[PDB]
From a paper:
To understand the molecular basis underlying the superbinding characteristics of the Legionella SH2 domains, we determined the structures of L. longbeachae LeSH and the L. pneumophila RavO SH2 domain in complex with tyrosine-phosphorylated peptides by X-ray crystallography. Compared to the Src SH2 domain, LeSH is missing two β-strands (βA and βF) but contains a 45-residue insert between the strand βE and the helix αB. This extra sequence in LeSH contains a structural motif called the pancreatic polypeptide (PP)-fold, comprising an amphipathic α-helix (named herein as αEF) packed against a polyproline segment via favorable hydrophobic contacts. Indeed, the SH2 and PP folds together form a clamp-like structure that grasp the pTyr residue.
Residue numbers in the entry: 11 to 167
Write the structure that this text describes.
Amino acid sequence: SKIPIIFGLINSYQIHNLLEQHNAKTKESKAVFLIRDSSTYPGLLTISYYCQEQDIVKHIRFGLTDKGWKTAPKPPHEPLKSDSPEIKEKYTLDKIKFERKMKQFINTAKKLFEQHIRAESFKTLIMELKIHEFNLEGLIKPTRSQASQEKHFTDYV
């Protein structure tokens, strides 16, 4: 009857309310966090937490590699109305780089996500959370109806 520790596709309002319910805003950044299915890239996991320094919720994506779960390529900073041509020209190159790297990363991550449903990959997720200094005692656990229904996570308990 065990519930996975991974959330399914939850919305931004729910993510913020879960972090606030667990007092993320009165604790150090990363002291409280949740793990959910990525809503942009199937097969990836997204860690959501509160960043005290900026007073915003932040997200970091992980995907399977041959070594286990690892940090995915990060996208370049969003365009702004105020952007100068110099900003925009650099964004072009950084966006192409991000798209190329994410394409290769997803291709490998999705193949691994699909084959080892019964997974000693779980321990490698814990390792990467530790390297990123997430307080494992601060993991928010989903209720049964909110947990991921992805088969890879059935035993992520």
